[PDB]
Design a protein around this ligand. Structure first.
Ligand SMILES: CC(=O)N[C@@H]1[C@@H](O)[C@H](O[C@@H]2O[C@H](CO)[C@@H](O[C@@H]3O[C@H](CO)[C@@H](O[C@@H]4O[C@H](CO)[C@@H](O[C@@H]5O[C@H](CO)[C@@H](O[C@@H]6O[C@H](CO)[C@@H](O)[C@H](O)[C@H]6NC(C)=O)[C@H](O)[C@H]5NC(C)=O)[C@H](O)[C@H]4NC(C)=O)[C@H](O)[C@H]3NC(C)=O)[C@H](O)[C@H]2NC(C)=O)[C@@H](CO)O[C@H]1O
Ligand SMILES: CCCCCCCCOCCOCCOCCOCCO
Ligand SMILES: [Ca+2]
Length: 435
């Protein structure tokens, strides 16, 4: 009990190797219809995290920094690769010019706790029930701001948790320095992001979550979720409905800052089931995103890396499958190899089928277009059981993504869709505790 007596000092070694090739569909290019190198780099990260206890069981603080080391990169590797640091230090300075190593302070937070109340402030990550979230590479992004919340415990009738967060700057993992928020024009200032959100846990495997947020004078964001786990033939079958919504506050549709027409939303239905050694997943999404952007974003600032928002649907099949009008169905399976006498090992695969994808409603693009995209992935995983490298995770991920058009990447009004892609990712994560 105390500031120093409960201190933790953990860290992690991270290694990341990647090769990603993409088809060039520009007709008068020299690589026409061939795969070209897009990302190719070896990168390592090192993190160190101090987390004090609580003095008077009320006040404490956390500090944390990480380094990034570039081990190898090709001339044709695009930038930024999001593991190393971008050569430009802030969000809205990004040139897509290069990468580099260095060191970043990603955690510097005073934390408070008394009775049913808690709070954090400084350089933080969202930790409560809001729809704000950080970008995650190996390390998370960081907001400059504060978060506070409390819990209403009703005993066995459940427990309501609510939380509010506010921030005026943000920094993605691949940036060393925080920057302000701005609109789609990357000029008009956004004073703050803030969000209120809550969760009710019935303590019978039914959970209701909801949150709304705001980018000052610009965007309004919404989130709801309902998840329930019950038995079918005596096995845990997990379920969840999800809703994500967004609006803008720009009257003029032709303004470069207007990104949505009316309410843009992403709705999702998930199913999970575990029979013996097989973990099955079956999930599907539907999107509506009328307006100039043409695709739904969970983050409230539309510029790349400016901020991030909560989104519980991740299929790790490269494409975000979030185009206006797009439907997508996902099916995966991981197979535990413990009954082959390989504990800690797992192999699995994924398949995504998407259809009915329409472009931005900006009239300069053909509104008659209908795009279909699919993908499949293979995953191998291993968590070391032996002593020395106990807990070190090894993951190999391969994905083959198919765009069923000849539209060049980012064109035709599909501002967030790219052409066919091969991707292989090799990860190693080794955590360690000093004290
Ligand atoms: C503890 C720990 O270490 N890990 C835990 C981990 O298990 C989990 O965390 C998860 O980790 C993984 C990585 O490890 C995260 O993976 C990331 O996933 C996101 C999607 O959510 C990926 O984001 C996309 O990234 C690509 C870049 O590669 C973006 O592509 C760009 O998009 C824009 C369009 O929006 C393009 O702009 C266009 O640019 C062209 C230029 O030619 C121009 O013509 C146009 O004008 C312009 N259009 C505009 C401006 O509108 C841009 O060019 C393009 N560029 C490229 C090269 O593609 C894409 O937009 C991103 N999508 C979204 C959405 O952000 C991200 O790439 C991926 N990272 C990696 C390394 O693969 C994962 O997100 C993370 N989170 C989760 C929830 O899983 C969990 C476990 O609990 O947490 C940790 O604990
Ligand atoms: C709290 O409310 C729970 C949310 O559950 C989803 C209800 O539907 C809302 C979709 O708009
Ligand atoms: Ca194709």
């Amino acid at each position: 009990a105390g500031f120093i007596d409960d201190s933790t000092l953990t860290g992690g070694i991270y290694y990341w190797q990647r090769e990603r090739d993409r088809k060039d569909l520009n007709p008068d290019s020299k690589d026409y219809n061939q795969y070209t190198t897009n990302l190719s780099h070896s990168t390592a990260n090192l993190s160190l995290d101090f987390a004090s206890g609580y003095a008077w069981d009320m006040f404490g603080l956390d500090v944390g920094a990480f380094t990034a080391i570039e081990l190898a990169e090709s001339s044709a590797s695009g930038h930024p690769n999001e593991i190393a640091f971008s050569s430009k230090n802030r969000t809205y300075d990004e040139d897509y010019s290069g990468d580099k190593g260095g060191v970043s302070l990603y955690k510097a937070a005073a934390k408070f706790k008394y009775g049913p109340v808690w709070a954090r402030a400084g350089y933080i990550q969202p930790s409560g029930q809001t729809l704000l979230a950080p970008h995650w590479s190996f390390m998370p992004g960081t907001y400059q701001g504060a978060e506070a919340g409390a819990k209403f415990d009703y005993g066995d009738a459940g427990a309501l948790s609510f939380s509010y967060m506010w921030a005026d700057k943000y920094k993605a993992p691949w940036h060393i320095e925080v920057d302000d928020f701005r609109q789609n024009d990357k000029k008009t200032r956004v004073s703050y992001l803030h969000s209120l959100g809550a969760k009710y846990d019935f303590k019978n495997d039914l959970v209701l979550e909801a949150a709304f947020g705001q980018a000052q004078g610009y965007v309004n964001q919404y989130f709801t979720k309902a998840s329930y786990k019950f038995d079918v033939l005596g096995n845990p079958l997990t379920t969840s409905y999800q809703f994500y919504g967004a609006e803008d506050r720009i009257s003029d549709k032709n303004d470069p800052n207007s990104i949505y027409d009316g309410l843009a939303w992403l709705q999702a239905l998930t199913f999970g089931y575990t029979t013996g050694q097989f973990n099955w997943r079956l999930e599907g999404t539907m999107v509506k995103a009328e307006g100039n952007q043409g695709f739904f974003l969970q983050r409230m600032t539309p510029t790349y890396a400016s901020s991030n928002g909560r989104l519980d649907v991740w299929w790790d099949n490269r494409s975000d499958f979030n185009a206006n009008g797009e439907k997508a169905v996902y099916a995966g399976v991981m197979y535990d190899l413990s009954n082959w006498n390989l504990p800690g090992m797992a192999v699995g695969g994924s398949y995504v089928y998407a259809w009915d994808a329409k472009p931005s409603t900006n009239p300069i693009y053909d509104q008659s277009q209908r795009l279909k995209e699919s993908a499949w992935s293979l995953d191998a995983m291993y968590t070391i059981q032996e002593g020395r490298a106990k807990g070190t995770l090894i993951k190999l991920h391969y994905t083959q993504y198919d765009n069923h058009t000849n539209i060049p990447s980012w064109g035709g009004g599909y501002g967030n869709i790219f052409q066919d892609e091969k991707d292989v990712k090799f990860m190693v994560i080794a955590p360690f505790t000093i004290f």
